[PDB]
Design an enzyme around this catalytic site. Structure first.
Site, PDB file in Angstrom:
ATOM      1  N   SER A  94      38.405  33.893  42.583  1.00 21.15           N
ATOM      2  CA  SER A  94      37.778  33.329  41.187  1.00 21.15           C
ATOM      3  C   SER A  94      38.580  33.952  40.071  1.00 21.15           C
ATOM      4  O   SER A  94      38.611  35.330  40.249  1.00 21.15           O
ATOM      5  CB  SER A  94      36.437  33.566  41.024  1.00 21.15           C
ATOM      6  OG  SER A  94      36.331  35.156  40.617  1.00 21.15           O
ATOM      7  N   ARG A  95      39.161  33.379  39.117  1.00 22.24           N
ATOM      8  CA  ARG A  95      40.122  34.187  38.154  1.00 22.24           C
ATOM      9  C   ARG A  95      39.282  34.714  37.113  1.00 22.24           C
ATOM     10  O   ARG A  95      39.880  35.592  36.604  1.00 22.24           O
ATOM     11  CB  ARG A  95      40.899  32.688  37.619  1.00 22.24           C
ATOM     12  CG  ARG A  95      41.783  32.025  38.417  1.00 22.24           C
ATOM     13  CD  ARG A  95      43.106  32.634  38.629  1.00 22.24           C
ATOM     14  NE  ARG A  95      43.748  32.715  37.418  1.00 22.24           N
ATOM     15  CZ  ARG A  95      44.420  31.585  36.881  1.00 22.24           C
ATOM     16  NH1 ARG A  95      44.172  30.421  37.275  1.00 22.24           N
ATOM     17  NH2 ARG A  95      44.913  31.707  35.754  1.00 22.24           N
TER      18      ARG A  95
END
Ligand SMILES: Nc1ncnc2c1ncn2[C@@H]1O[C@H](COP(=O)(O)OP(=O)(O)OP(=O)(O)O)[C@@H](O)[C@H]1O
Ligand SMILES: Nc1ncnc2c1ncn2[C@@H]1O[C@H](COP(=O)(O)OP(=O)(O)OP(=O)(O)O)[C@@H](O)[C@H]1O
Ligand SMILES: Nc1ncnc2c1ncn2[C@@H]1O[C@H](COP(=O)(O)OP(=O)(O)O)[C@@H](O)[C@H]1O
Ligand SMILES: [Mg+2]
Ligand SMILES: [Mg+2]
Ligand SMILES: [Mg+2]
Lengths: 471, 187, 55, 509, 254, 120
Positions: free
Chosen positions: D371-372
């Site tokens: 997940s960024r």
């Protein structure tokens, strides 16, 4: 008769007609005059200046331009009812078995729509067939949808003719076998395998099956509409009568694949690897009419050819969503003599659930699959270290896993002409008990050749005594 | 849309689109035998080093080739439905194919009483006593209330016969029959 | 080209998935072990069965 | 070159006279119908992307404006359209009902009703084809969005106003990560707070009907169809109805964004919209590209998946979170559509079928998932324990080859094989059992701190279930001191030490 | 262009067809009326396997009973004339040519003559089968009846499919290989075996035209190259050479 | 915009493009909406000229200069793919940011063994 058109352009199996007075809609039927056989053309496109683009259902030899074409006013109208049992029928609803005509009082046009959202029965059940891989690892359901995958020569006409023996004789409801483009040899066995077995009776009215046969010696416009003549006879038994039906179709890949044979001659740009651009639309138009509504039920078993053992091909990989239960036969397993070839780590059902099959059935079949995935991590070590380098715990794994792999095999009754063994039919309560004990350790003292091709676990100790007496 | 009268030729291409839209439009109101007399007068004013200088010129204007022919097509003799047709071809961009349509309308209108003539291909020409039979025994075939026409072309490679083609018939009697003596050399 | 999801990787038990000369060197090595344990076990069966009756 | 509207019946009237009988400014006749694509002569005033309405009662959508005809896709069957059928105009881009009269109802992609209760009672509309917010009306995401899965909330977390791609092979557990994302919200959606509620939407594209019917009954019985809209373009439909169906559901979830509420939408799956567009392009003869997709197919999933935003205080304070689902084919994340949608979104969650049979369910790969945003979209207590947990389950992956044949190793390497296999046993989780957040901070606190090394690995998945039922009932006052304060203070970090060790004694019996 | 017979006028496979090869007759037997595919590379034995079969029926054809004979047919597609005029030599010292026919469309012929050849050779086979006797037919080979359909139907402006093959290459081979029947005994009881040869590139069996014809035939004979060179000649992979045994009409002593 | 501070002012401009693959991928979408037949693996026929007419306007003239700094995405780990092959023909340096050097505590995360420069 209306709109007696005229033929202009016969290029392959795609005839174009031109109407003077009345244009017919899409999806109709047209009757080419002056032929001693019945050739039926179905409308598919409207081109402009009153010309349509049809598709023949027979051979296009002898079609001279300027030939009259009548019109019926509806799609293709087959016979249907109770009197279609113990018969073999054509794509346009005709007899092909030379017994005379079909005398019914009700016809059904083969183009209908999928029943709505508010007509969906929700309940799940279980179904016991007798096989130790179906009933243990990918169990069926009364009313579900079942697909048999796998390549060529792995066991799909045997596994589908064994379930016709197991289920479709001990059943109160009816069955339909639709042959969508397969070998005409194999369509002569099952006509005669079921005359001696009582499912077809040629003198009285107590037969319990109906046959639909358009095979692979047929032009590729008629190998796309025997998939729909099937589930129009297999829907009058569900909707009109409130009965229960079984649906057997072999093979359903020839419905898709015979739509790619007339795509570019119709005038479309071809999609990816060579299929028509309407793959997942003409398929899902058909695979939504095979459902269980709140007026009846349908239990559908369909054989699905995987071309060149390539499961990521677009013709099988868009069929994995129209199905409740998948039994995937591999070829690297049937080369080891294991029969049925069913892959344990690739079959899957929806009702494998600790609230329908019980929390003892579930703990077993999630330990069979867990010890077979533990095997493959050891097979990469054996190829370098050899067998007599492993530790004493990992040797215990390979021996049970090879005992389990041999115990998943079972002699079918239709292998009484191939192998010469005798057939089994294992109940479910013994299937769970037998596999529960090999994981425990209560048969660690036997040779593996006892377990090959037996039924219950009590027959797998009656072989280890005969091997020791004849030693 | 509406249904239209079937032309008895039914050619195809960019000619027979426009050359059937003219046959169907003029067969309404029974303007058929008249309109061929008017299409043969535009068939002379098209070939003019000022008219054909801009009837096929790309670079004049898209618009001024429409007013220049509409003023031209109305004033001199006629204002029938052909004045709309010349305005129809010019509005679309098909002015180059204008001699094609009238050669296509002529073959479409000819078969309303015509024959699609035969082609006697024999030798140096003949006398009156052997030709007026073949201009009468070739009328005994058709028998549909018609007045026949014909073409003649001289060829000497046919050594000793005549070929004739009533429509697409081709009854061949010639010196092909030397090649048919291959069966003597063919075991 | 393995430290990326885009770069391809391998499965577990792929040596016998190819069919080479290591997949054959392992399919036969397992039969040369579990054929000779099948007559250590086989010989002992007569005695074991008797023993069950005894106790 | 001939031109489409140069047929022998169009030219035939213009030789007769002027076209006064039909007007052609508003109604146009049909030239040629085939395979759901029509050709219409006339309709000079039709805007691009405008609904038309055929003579037999069906609808349309205008896509090709051409110099002599217009090509319009047809909704529904094609055996009702013919050649010579008058078409008319409505005068607008397509619009869909929108309100809060949708909650608890099941709608198709045009806003109609299918569950048979009754007609929708909303008094508002919205165009499906609107734009995203700009650079300015947004703000960086800070809100937790909780799933109830110990893996998704502690290793790859989601926030509110984020895209997160559920990617993985067939038969892997895709539809089930996103069905207890829904069921978990009932904790907050019946209480009294307003900035913790959530209103979920589920979009089903191309599935069969009786998998949706098995989903309105999964959610009714778990009591989560009083805040869930179900949008369902299923497989038996026409191809443009499955093309609109994520725009039709992203306008239903923007009214909850413009008004200070929150929402969450689940496209299931976006690899069947992209095939439904491709069927429509290559019959309109638009030029192909790689894998016969048209050129503008990155433009399909970029203007849709950028409408999910986190707005700011001067616009209302709304949100929209999107979880799109994509199915690969045998681990091939380098095909055409699976490489558009990895570039657009903000992370992926990658599920494998090898881990599904080795006994790890939910079958999440942790190494190939990201997940960024990550650690900003977590609560201050889940941030505290997972920073020691994500690191130590990463050291196990490097020594994960040694474990098969190993006892002659170093005591440090024999430690990473020990601690890493207890934390893997914690993350197992049964189907349809979402957890509260501060309960997961109890379980994960036991493993990563050292209170599970002296146990047997088949006794880990028993100990967790016996540790939770003791702490729900006899310690309910301390599972509301994390749900309120948020951060584990030292006055709670010293109290859970006196619970786990005073339960680890009287357990093994 | 005639039609294959349907479901009523067949029967199952009762009889044997002896090839005289010892790896074929014992391990992979072939009944009479069964389509068997000889597949493999170039220069491995595909023509020789189907010419020992032509020779070996010499002993039944000078015998006395009319129901043990086997009249044969060889179809040469895409072969140069300095192979087909040399195979008539090998078939005439052993006096094999007194009971066969050779339908020949060489590589010099027009591309519509290599397309028409197996449909003409199969129609001389059905003089025998539709009158009582037993025939046998070899297509050498059927990867050269496909590139004569790809070329002939590209110059007619028909749009290409995969590898520029037309849409109905499966329909091209399937309407051929279903006339190989085994009629019931109230029609005459005659049979028509078929032995299609297929050349594959680099021993890969997952190509387009191989897999379309593996799934029409009852069984196969997989000829390899590493068997031929190690020493097993005829190089038959007896592990993979599966066969639906043809109601197991091997014979009683074998 | 970057040339007024080269032409009309005479300074040393910088210019960041994020990233050089989405410039290339968008040219293949324009070129396929018009109708042009594609090149090797699926890109547009004018792939090197279109990169040429953009990358040649970044030079060092007599007034000033433009420098450039461009991020590159390598598809499917394929350093011989047609889009990063064509972009590498214009480069005068590389910079690689890797995950491992950040773990050591070193900032900026630059890999000094895999970062090159042509003017070395
Ligand atoms: N956490 C879990 N524990 C146990 N079983 C699970 C879990 N998650 C999923 N399953 C099982 O996986 C099976 C199929 O999962 P599901 O269909 O939800 O995945 P999917 O990848 O979406 O499949 P498809 O893509 O075909 O819809 C279900 O029968 C369910 O029992
Ligand atoms: N039984 C056999 N034992 C040993 N060698 C053989 C046998 N049969 C054939 N050969 C040899 O193998 C070679 C190839 O045989 P053949 O010509 O039948 O192969 P082919 O694949 O049909 O050739 P082509 O690829 O040209 O069709 C020949 O030189 C032949 O002499
Ligand atoms: N009990 C059995 N299990 C596995 N295979 C068998 C069994 N009995 C026979 N076979 C062989 O396996 C082959 C399977 O082919 P078949 O199932 O008939 O067609 P398909 O190609 O559709 O799988 C048969 O030719 C048969 O010879
Ligand atoms: Mg079969
Ligand atoms: Mg799903
Ligand atoms: Mg040969």
């Amino acid at each position: 008769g209306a709109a007696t058109g005229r033929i202009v352009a016969v290029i392959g199996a795609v005839v174009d007609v031109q109407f003077d007075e009345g244009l017919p809609p899409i999806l109709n039927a047209l009757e080419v005059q002056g032929r001693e056989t019945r050739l039926v053309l179905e409308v598919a496109q409207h081109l402009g200046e009153s010309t349509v683009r049809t598709i023949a259902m027979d051979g296009t030899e002898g079609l001279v331009r300027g030939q009259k074409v009548l019109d019926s006013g509806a799609p293709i109208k087959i016979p249907v009812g109770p009197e279609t049992l113990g018969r073999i029928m054509n794509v346009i609803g005709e007899p092909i078995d030379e017994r005379g005509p079909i005398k019914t009082k009700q016809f059904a046009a083969i183009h209908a729509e999928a029943p709505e959202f508010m007509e969906m029965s929700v309940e799940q059940e279980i179904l016991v067939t007798g096989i130790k891989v179906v009933d243990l690892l990918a169990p069926y359901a009364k009313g579900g949808k079942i697909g048999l995958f796998g390549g060529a020569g792995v066991g799909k006409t045997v596994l589908i003719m064994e379930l016709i023996n197991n289920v479709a004789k001990a059943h109160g409801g009816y069955s339909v076998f639709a042959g969508v483009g397969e070998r005409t040899r194999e369509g002569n066995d099952l006509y005669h395998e079921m005359i001696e077995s009582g499912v077809i009776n040629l003198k009285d009215a107590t037969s319990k099956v109906a046959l639909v046969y358009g095979q692979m010696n047929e032009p590729p416009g008629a190998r796309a509409r025997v998939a729909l003549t099937g589930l129009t006879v297999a829907e009058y038994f569900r909707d009109q009568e409130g009965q229960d039906v079984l649906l057997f179709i072999d093979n359903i890949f020839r419905f898709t694949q015979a739509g790619s044979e007339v795509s570019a001659l119709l005038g479309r740009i071809p999609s990816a690897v060579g299929y028509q651009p309407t793959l997942a639309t003409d398929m899902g138009t058909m695979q939504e009419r095979i459902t269980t509504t709140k007026k009846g039920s349908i239990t559908s078993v369909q054989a699905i050819y995987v071309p060149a053992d390539d499961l990521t091909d677009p013709a099988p990989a868009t069929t994995f969503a129209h199905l409740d239960a998948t039994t995937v036969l591999s070829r690297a397993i049937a080369e080891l003599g294991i029969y049925p070839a069913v892959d344990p780590l690739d079959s899957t059902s929806r009702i494998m659930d600790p609230n329908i099959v019980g929390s003892e059935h579930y703990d077993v079949a999630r330990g069979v699959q867990k010890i077979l995935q533990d095997y493959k991590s050891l097979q990469d070590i054996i190829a370098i270290l050899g067998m007599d380098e492993l530790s004493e715990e990992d040797k215990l794994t390979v021996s049970r896993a090879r005992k389990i792999q041999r115990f998943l095999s079972q002699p079918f009754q239709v292998a009484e002409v191939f192998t010469g063994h005798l057939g089994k039919l294992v109940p479910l309560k013994e299937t769970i008990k037998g596999f529960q004990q090999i994981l425990a350790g209560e048969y660690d003292h036997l040779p593996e050749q006892a377990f090959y091709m037996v039924g219950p676990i009590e027959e797998a100790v009656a072989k280890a005594d005969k091997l020791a007496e004849e030693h | 849309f509406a249904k239209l009268v079937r032309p008895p030729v039914q050619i195809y291409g960019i000619e027979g689109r426009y050359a059937t839209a003219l046959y169907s439009a003029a067969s309404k109101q029974n303007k058929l035998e008249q309109v061929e007399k008017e299409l043969l007068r535009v068939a002379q004013i098209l070939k003019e080093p000022k008219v054909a200088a801009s009837i096929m010129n790309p670079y004049v204007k898209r618009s001024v080739k429409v007013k220049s022919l509409s003023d031209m097509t109305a004033k001199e003799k006629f204002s029938p439905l052909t004045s709309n047709l010349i305005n129809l071809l010019a509005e679309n961009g098909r002015l180059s194919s204008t001699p094609g349509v009238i050669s296509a309308f002529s073959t479409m209108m000819s078969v309303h009483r015509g024959e699609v003539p035969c082609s006697v291909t024999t030798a140096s020409p003949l006398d009156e006593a052997t030709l007026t039979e073949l201009k009468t025994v070739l009328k005994s075939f058709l028998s549909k209330g018609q007045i026949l026409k014909l073409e003649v072309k001289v060829d000497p490679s046919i050594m000793g016969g005549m070929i004739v083609r009533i429509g697409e018939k081709y009854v061949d009697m010639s010196a092909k029959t030397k090649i048919q003596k291959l069966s003597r050399a063919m075991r | 080209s393995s430290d990326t999801p885009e770069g391809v990787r391998s499965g577990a038990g792929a040596v016998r998935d190819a069919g080479g000369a290591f997949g054959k060197k392992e399919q036969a090595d397992e039969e040369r072990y579990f054929r000779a344990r099948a007559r250590e076990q086989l010989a002992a069966l007569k005695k074991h069965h008797e023993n069950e009756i005894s106790h | 070159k001939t031109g489409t509207a140069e047929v022998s019946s169009i030219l035939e009237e213009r030789i007769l006279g002027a076209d006064t009988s039909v007007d052609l400014e508003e109604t146009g006749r049909v030239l040629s119908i085939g395979d759901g694509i029509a050709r219409v002569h006339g309709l000079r005033n039709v805007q691009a992307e405008e609904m038309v309405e055929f003579s037999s009662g069906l609808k349309g959508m205008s896509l090709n404006l051409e110099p002599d005809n217009v090509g319009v896709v047809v909704f529904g069957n094609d055996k009702l359209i013919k050649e010579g059928d008058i078409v008319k105009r409505t005068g607008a881009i397509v619009d869909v009902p929108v309100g809060e009269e949708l909650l608890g109802r099941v709608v198709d992609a045009l806003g109609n009703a299918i569950d048979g209760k009754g007609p929708i009672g909303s008094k508002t509309r919205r165009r499906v084809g609107l734009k995203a917010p700009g650079i300015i009306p947004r703000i960086s995401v800070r809100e937790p969005m909780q799933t109830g899965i110990k893996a998704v909330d502690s290793l790859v977390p989601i926030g509110r106003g984020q895209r997160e791609l559920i990617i993985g092979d067939r038969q892997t557990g895709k539809t089930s990560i996103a069905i207890d994302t829904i069921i978990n919200q009932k904790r907050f959606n019946d209480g009294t707070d307003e900035k913790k509620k959530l209103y979920c939407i589920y979009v089903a594209i191309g599935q069969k009907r009786s998998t949706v019917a098995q989903l309105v009954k999964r959610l009714t019985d778990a009591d989560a169809m009083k805040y869930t809209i179900v949008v369902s373009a299923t497989a038996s439909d026409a191809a443009p109805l499955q093309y609109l169906a994520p725009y039709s559901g992203c306008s239903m979830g923007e009214y909850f964004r413009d008004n200070g509420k929150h929402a969450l939408i689940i496209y299931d799956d976006l690899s069947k919209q992209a095939v439904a567009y491709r069927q429509m392009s290559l019959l309109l003869r638009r030029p192909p590209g790689r894998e016969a997709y048209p050129g503008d197919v990155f433009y399909l999933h970029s203007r849709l998946l950028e409408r999910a935003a986190k707005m700011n205080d001067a616009f209302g304070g709304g949100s929209l979170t999107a979880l799109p689902v994509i199915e690969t084919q045998a681990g091939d994340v380098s095909a055409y559509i699976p490489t558009n949608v990895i570039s657009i979104t903000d992370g992926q969650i990658f599920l494998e079928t090898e881990l599904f049979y080795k006994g790890i369910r939910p079958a999440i790969n942790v190494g190939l998932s990201v997940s960024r945003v990550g650690s900003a979209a977590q609560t201050r207590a889940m941030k505290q324990v997972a920073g020691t947990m994500k690191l130590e389950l990463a050291q196990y992956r490097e020594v994960a080859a040694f474990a098969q044949f190993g006892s002659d190793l170093d005591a440090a390497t024999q430690q990473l094989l020990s601690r890493g296999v207890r934390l893997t046993e914690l993350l197992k989780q049964g189907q349809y059992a979402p957890m509260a957040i501060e309960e997961q901070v109890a379980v994960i606190y036991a493993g990563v701190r050292g209170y599970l090394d002296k146990l047997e690995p088949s006794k880990i998945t028993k100990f967790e279930n016996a540790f939770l039922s003791h702490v729900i009932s006899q310690h309910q006052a301390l599972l509301g001191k994390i749900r309120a304060d948020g951060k584990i203070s030292e006055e709670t970090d010293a109290k859970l030490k006196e619970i786990v060790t005073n339960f680890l004694a009287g357990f093994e019996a």
